[PDB]
Design a protein around this motif. Sequence first.
Motif: not given
Length: 132
Positions: A16, A38-40, A125, A127
Amino acid sequence: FVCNTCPEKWINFQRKCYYFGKGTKQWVHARYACDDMEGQLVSIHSPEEQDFLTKHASHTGSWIGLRNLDLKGEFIWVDGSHVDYSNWAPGEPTSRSQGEDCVMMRGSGRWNDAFCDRKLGAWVCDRLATCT
């Protein structure tokens, strides 16, 4: 197969990529911020990831991707998985439930649940890293 390519200002750990946001935000707003990039909001599943996260944590506390869902009584990560690894501070979590419950990581890396409209100065975050 090496997976540790990350976007700029993100840091790789294993599979990640992580972002350590700064700026006063509520939980849902931190959720949006993560989405914008554009991640969480980060989901945490092992001692080694927490350990990574604790070493890069903000002293003021950070929002993470964990929140109470009173329709199943449980804390669920925004990635959808249940709680396996946990790093609750002593006595925590205190506030399930109480529907509107969110989770934050202290400067020390330990977690506590908190009212969602609380304002935190950091947020994290994640991703997937890209590969070569």
